[PDB]
Every structure is written in C-alpha cells, then in structure tokens.
Design a protein around this nucleic acid. Structure first.
Length: 388
RNA sequence: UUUUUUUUUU
C-alpha cells in the first residue's frame, strides 16, 4: 500500500523499489503477482534492469517454472540487457535442481565464452549439482579447478563437499575435510555441524552425533532448528521415539521454535512406529499452534494410513488435503497409487494416474513401475504396454 | 536491491 501513497505524493519510484517488491512477492510465494508488477513497471516507463530479470528468473526456477525463466532470459538478451555472472549462477542452479546437469555445464561453458568469469558462487553451485548427481568425482575436480583459478573456497564450499562426501558414504573423508577447513581461516558454522551431525546419524553413529552437538554448543555455535530436526530424525530412525519427543520438548524450552519439518519428522516417526494416534494428535496440535501442514505432512500421514491398511482414512486425508488448497505432488500420487494397487483397486489407481497427468504433475519412475506392476497382475498385459 | 551449502514424506 505504501507504494501507491509514495507515488501519490511526488516521489518517483526507483527501479530498486520495484526490484525489492518483486523479490518480496517471489519469496512470499505469489509469483504471478510479481510478474504483474513487472508488467506494470515496464508500462510506467521504468526499465527493468539486470537485477529485475535475475530476480524473476530465480523465482520462476524455484516455482518449478524453468522454461518460463528461460523465456525471460531470451527476452533480456533481446533487449540488450546483458546477463551477468548472477544471471548465469541462477540458471545454472535452476538447471541442476531440475535434473539438467548437462545443460548447466553448457551455461557454465557459455559464460566463460562471454568474458564472464565464474565466481565462488558459480563453483559452489556446480560442486553441489555435481555431488547431488552422484558425481563426487567431478565435484572434487572442480574444487581443484577453482583453487587453480585463484578463487578462494569459503564456508559454503567446504559445507557443500562435507555433505557430498557424507551422502556418498565417505564419513571419514568428510571429517578429515572438516579438520582441513578448520586448519585454515575458515570457521565452521551451524551448517557444517548440522551436516556432520546428519552424516553421523545416517551412518548409525548417533552418539557421535550427540557428542558433536555438545561440541558445537561448547564452541559457541548456537544450534538452530535444523540442528534439532536432524537429531530428532536421527532418534526416531534409531527407534528411540521417547528420546525424540524429549528433544522436542527440550528445543521448545531452549527457545527454539519447532517448524513444519519438526512436526513432519515426529509424525513420520510415530506413523512408522504404528502410533497413528499420537501422530494425528501432533497433526492437530501443529495446526492449532499455527504451523501450516504442507504436502509432506499429508504425504507422511497418508503413507502411514495405507501402510496400516486404513485405506479409507488415507483417501480421506487426500480429500481434506485438496480441500485445504494443499497441492499434491508425485509423492502423494505414488503413495496412494501404491496403496490402492496393493488393495486390488487398480482401476482407481489408474484413475489417480489420469488425474495426476491432468493437473500437471510428472509421473516419475516409481509411478511407471507401479502402474505397470498393477496392470500386470490383473491381468491386462496389452493394457500396460499401451500405458507406457 | 537478485544467485550457492545442512534436516522431514513415496
């Protein structure tokens, strides 16, 4: 509202004010209103700049609308508004996270071709894409390459590689790398410790994780919500749910405020244990304390109910889910498809795939495998061949 | 004023 008022008087809105606003709308979520602000400013004769483009482009990548981001990239190049190292960083990230690492490497080549030097963020972004694509190998290569270029690895560089190494099973390497970053002027942070803690929990070394938690508290590094979500998931997975609820209480007492992941993590643990009551209790409680269940909450509950054989209840939560405006995803659909299919409700399952395709959700491997399976033991085999 | 790392669901 302050905008109209500022206009009203004699203050001509800058491009930075529109950029600030558009960023706000792109974070707050509402993308299409951001686009609308873009058109409004274009109209008023205020020229969108390279920051305007980068902002919208980022927001479109993170709304899943990649190809639209690329439309905007095209458009900015048409206008002579030259993409900069940030434009390319944004797009490289967007491509890596949409499973198009090869195209990302393309943009990486191209920016150099245009006299744009990759910076520490470019490298961090690619080392992350590389790791998450299984290519630890290439990631470390890149880590050598950036030092060759005189670009100084930062905390994010080390955090990224510590994580990749953990995820590949190489806990010992991650630890040695942690030591290396300390032996340098790089002070680890909450993320370094959170990453290491997660790595220790995943490898079944929960007490080493708790030790490390003590050490970060000692070293003056305040644990955050992620720290506690990580230890809570570790305890639930280790089968120690009492202790996890204890840590939950404890974080509330330490002034850490549980978020949606805290609640999903607990709901998962309780569902997996078969304590579907306590789980539903926490679902209602989170809504009560005003923490909006997302798609993972409902997915988690639905899978808990299907696994218990409470199909009706599960389906019901799917309905309530939609009615609350919560948009399903491929996980929701794989879960119900799976559950229906186990129940000899292959027809409905197929219908669920139909709807899935009709709302604009990609089916993914598991969906394919699953509906093929169900089509088979049915048994309509030509029906499956045509479905693929 | 915009871009990179850690935790939860099939």
């Amino acid at each position: 509202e302050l905008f109209a008022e500022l206009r009203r008087q004699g203050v001509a809105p800058t491009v930075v004010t529109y950029n600030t606003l558009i960023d706000g709308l792109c974070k707050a979520g509402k993308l299409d209103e951001a686009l609308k602000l873009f058109e409004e400013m274009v109209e008023k004769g205020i020229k969108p700049d390279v920051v305007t483009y980068n902002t919208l482009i980022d927001g479109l990548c993170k709304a899943g609308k990649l190809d639209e981001a690329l439309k905007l990239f095209e458009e900015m190049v048409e206008k002579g508004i030259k993409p900069d190292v940030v434009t390319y960083n944004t797009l490289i990230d967007g491509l890596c996270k949409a499973g198009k690492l090869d195209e990302a490497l393309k943009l990486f080549e191209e920016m150099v071709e245009k006299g744009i030097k990759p910076d520490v963020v470019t490298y961090n972004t690619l080392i992350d894409g590389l790791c998450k694509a299984g290519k630890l190998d290439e990631a470390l290569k890149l880590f050598e390459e950036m030092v060759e270029k005189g670009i100084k690895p930062d905390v994010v560089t080390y955090n990224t590689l510590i994580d990749g190494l953990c995820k590949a099973g190489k806990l010992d390497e991650a630890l040695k790398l942690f030591e290396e970053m300390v032996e340098k002027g790089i002070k680890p942070d909450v993320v370094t410790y959170n990453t290491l803690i997660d790595g220790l929990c995943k490898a079944g070394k929960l007490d080493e994780a708790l030790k490390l938690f003590e050490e970060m508290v000692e070293k003056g590094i305040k644990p955050d919500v992620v720290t506690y979500n990580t230890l809570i998931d570790g305890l639930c997975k280790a089968g120690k749910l009492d202790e996890a609820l204890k840590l939950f209480e404890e974080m509330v007492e330490k002034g850490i405020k549980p978020d949606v992941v805290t609640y999903n993590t607990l709901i998962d643990g309780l569902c997996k244990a078969g304590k579907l009551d306590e789980a539903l209790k926490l679902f209602e409680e989170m809504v009560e304390k005003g923490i909006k269940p997302d798609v993972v909450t409902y997915n988690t509950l639905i899978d808990g109910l299907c696994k218990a054989g409470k199909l009706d209840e599960a389906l019901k939560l799917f309905e309530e889910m939609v009615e609350k405006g919560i948009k399903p995803d491929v996980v929701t659909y794989n879960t119900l498809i799976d559950g229906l299919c186990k129940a000899g409700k292959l027809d409905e399952a197929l219908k669920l795939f139909e709807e899935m395709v009709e709302k604009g959700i990609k089916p993914d491997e598991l969906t394919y495998r699953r509906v093929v399976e169900s089509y088979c033991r049915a048994k309509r085999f030509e029906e499956a061949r045509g479905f693929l």
